[PDB]
Subunit: 254 residues, 3 copies
C-alpha cells in the first residue's frame, strides 16, 4: 500500500520542504527503512519513504510487477487531482522523469527512483537513482568524499617562443600542471622568451620556477613564469641547434 501524507496548503509545504533540502522536480529523497524484497518478477517495497516534489509518502508492502529480461526504471507518479490515490508506481523501459511542477501548476509528476534489472524469472540487480542536493554556497568544517569531486578545468597552449611549447591545465582556478613540448634554440640565460605570454587566468601571484628536461640527455633547464605572464629562460645558453624540451611542472595560482 501507499500511504500519503503531504497531500490534499500542501503545495506551500511542498515548496518549503524542497527549498530546505535543495531538491528540484527531477530528483527524490528516498530511504529503505527495510530492504525491498524480490520474489519472481516483482519488487516489493516493504518500508520505503519517498519525497517527490516536496511531497512525503510511504511504500508499505507495495509491489511493482516487472517485465522479464530487461532494465526496469521504477517511477513514482504524482497526480494531485486523484484525491483518494494521488501516488502510483510504474515499471518503465526508460527513465521518463518529466520535472513537472505540481506545486505551482497542473499535470502529473513522474520521477524515477529505482532501476531494477531482471532475468527471465527473477531480479538480478538493483541500482537506486541518485538523490541530488542542489545548493548555492556551502560553509563546512569537514568533508569526506567516497566517489569524486568535480572542479572546473581550464586548458591553455602557449607558444612561448624559441620553439618551446607549454600546455597548461588549471583545476579549481588554482592548481596548474604545465607540460613542456617542442624544442628550444637561440636563447640565453635570463632572456625573456620571444613568443606568447601566458593568458591572465593562468598567471600566478608570484614568480614560478618550472624545471624541465632535455629528452635523451642528462641535462636540465628551468623557466620562470612571471606574474605579468612573461616567461624567462633560466637554462644555459642554447645555440642554433634545437633541443627537445619535456617535463611536468606544477604551481599554485593563489
Amino acid at each position: 500500500t501507499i500511504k500519503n501524507f503531504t497531500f490534499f496548503g500542501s503545495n506551500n509545504d511542498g515548496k518549503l520542504y524542497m527549498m530546505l533540502t535543495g531538491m528540484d522536480y527531477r530528483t527524490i529523497r528516498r530511504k529503505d527503512w527495510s530492504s525491498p524484497l524480490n520474489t519472481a518478477l516483482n519488487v516489493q517495497y516493504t518500508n520505503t519513504s519517498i519525497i517527490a516534489g516536496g511531497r512525503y509518502f510511504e511504500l508499505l508492502n507495495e509491489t511493482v510487477a516487472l517485465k522479464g529480461d530487461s532494465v526496469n526504471y521504477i517511477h513514482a507518479n504524482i497526480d494531485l487531482t486523484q484525491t483518494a490515490n494521488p501516488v502510483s508506481l510504474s515499471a518503465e523501459t526508460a527513465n521518463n522523469s518529466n520535472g513537472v511542477d505540481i506545486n505551482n501548476g497542473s499535470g502529473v509528476l513522474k520521477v524515477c527512483f529505482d532501476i531494477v534489472t531482471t532475468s527471465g524469472t527473477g531480479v538480478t540487480s538493483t541500482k537506486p537513482i541518485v538523490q541530488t542536493s542542489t545548493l548555492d554556497s556551502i560553509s563546512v568544517n569537514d568533508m569526506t568524499v567516497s566517489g569524486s569531486i568535480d572542479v572546473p578545468v581550464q586548458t591553455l597552449t602557449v607558444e612561448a617562443g624559441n620553439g618551446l611549447q607549454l600546455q597548461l591545465t588549471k583545476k579549481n582556478n588554482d592548481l596548474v600542471i604545465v607540460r613542456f613540448f617542442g624544442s628550444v634554440s637561440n636563447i640565453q640565460k635570463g632572456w625573456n622568451m620571444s613568443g606568447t605570454w601566458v593568458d591572465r587566468p593562468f598567471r600566478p601571484a608570484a614568480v614560478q620556477s618550472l624545471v624541465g628536461h632535455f629528452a635523451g640527455r642528462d641535462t636540465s633547464f628551468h623557466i620562470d613564469i612571471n606574474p605579468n605572464g612573461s616567461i624567462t629562460w633560466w637554462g644555459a645558453n642554447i645555440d642554433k641547434t634545437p633541443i627537445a624540451t619535456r617535463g611536468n611542472g606544477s604551481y599554485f595560482i593563489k
Copy 2:
C-alpha cells in the same frame, strides 16, 4: 501581495527549519518560480518563495519601488508583532541585514536577498544574494562544483642552511608545493643541511625527494625532506662558490 505561512508554535518550527537546512539569521532560502518583472523604477516579484529566519512566505505580484542611479539592496523585514502583515519589503542604499533572532526574542529581522542596480529610468542589472548552507561534517558520494572550493592554506619559509631557502605552500593540510630560492655552497651528498628543520605541520609521512635546478645552467640537484623535518642534500658536492637554486617540487603529507 505577501502570503504568510510559517507565521503568527511558529517559532519552534522556525528553529526546526533553520536547523534542517543549516541557515542562520544572516541568510535566506529563495526561489523564483517565475521571473521578476521590471517596469521603470520597480521590481515586481511574480512568484517568489523566501525562507527567512526559518519562516516561509511567498511574494505574489509584489512590487518594490526603487531609487534611481544606484544599487538597491532589497530586504525582507520580519516583525512578528504585526500579525496581519509580519513581512514587508524595502529597497535600501546598503546591505542592512541585522541578524536579529526573532524566534527567541523580540526585534525586527532584516535580511537582504536581492541586489538591483538602476539607471535614471530603469533596471540595468540584478544579482541575487548568496544562499548559505552552514554545515558541520558532510559525508558525500559525489560533488560537482561550478565555482571554487576554498580550502585552508598554510605557508612557511625555511632557511634550510648552506644558503638554501624553501618556500612551502600547503593546501587542505595535504598537498605541498615547495619553491626553491637562495643558493647552495659547502655541502656534500648525503649531508643534512645545516639550518632550520621543516616545521611539524609541513613534515611528510615518508621521505620526499624534490628535484631542483641551478639557475642559468643545465645541471640539477635534489633534496630529501625526511619525516623528522631534516633536509638531506643529494646533489653533487658543492664547493665554496654559491650556486643559485630554483624550482617547484610537490609532495603529499598523508
Copy 3:
C-alpha cells in the same frame, strides 16, 4: 525543563525531517541559542534546541548532573511510550549511542550530543559531538572548508624494469604524484622499460613526462608514462652500472 515538539503522525514527520536534512539515528542537529552554564558538577542548558531521530525538542534551563573527575558523555534519550516526558538527559561514562529506530519500531533511542570533562569540583572543558550530514550527490556553486576534505586515495608500486621503482599515489581519482626509487641500468633513450606497465587506474589520458634526478650527481632524466601504461626511458644511455634514481613528479589523469 524539556519542551517536546515533534511528539506524541509524529513518526512520519520525524522520518520526513531526517530525510530533508540527511541525518541517521546516530547523530543530531544541535544549536545553543544561549550558552550552557556550568556550576559545580552540573551543566545547565539555558536554551538549546536538538533534533534527534528527526524529533525537535528544546532544553530550557535543563540541568544534567555530572560525575566527578571524568569524561561525561551527555545523551538525549527518547522513549515514546513515556507520553508526558518522552525525552530525558543522562551523563554516562562512555558514548552509548544505540541508533534505535524509534520512528519504525519500539525501543529507546540514545544519542550523545556533548562531551563534558570534570575535576573534583567543576567542569574543566566541554566539546560538542559532530553534526553529520549524510548526502548522496551535491551540486554547488562555491564551498569553503575550515578543516579538511578527505578524498579517495589509491596507492601503487610499479616495478618498472631495469631497476627503476615507481611509487604512485592518486587522490580524487585525478591527481597523481610519482616518487622514483631504485636504480637504472642497461637502458637506451627511447626504449620502453622492461618491467611491469602501470595498472589501468593510474594511466593518464595523454603521455606524461616526469623529471627525475640521479642521487649524488648533477644529472637528470625523464620518463614518459604512456596512455597504454608503458613507460619510455628518455634519459641518456645507461650502461651496466646502476645509478640511483629519485624525485617527485606529478600529473593529472583527466
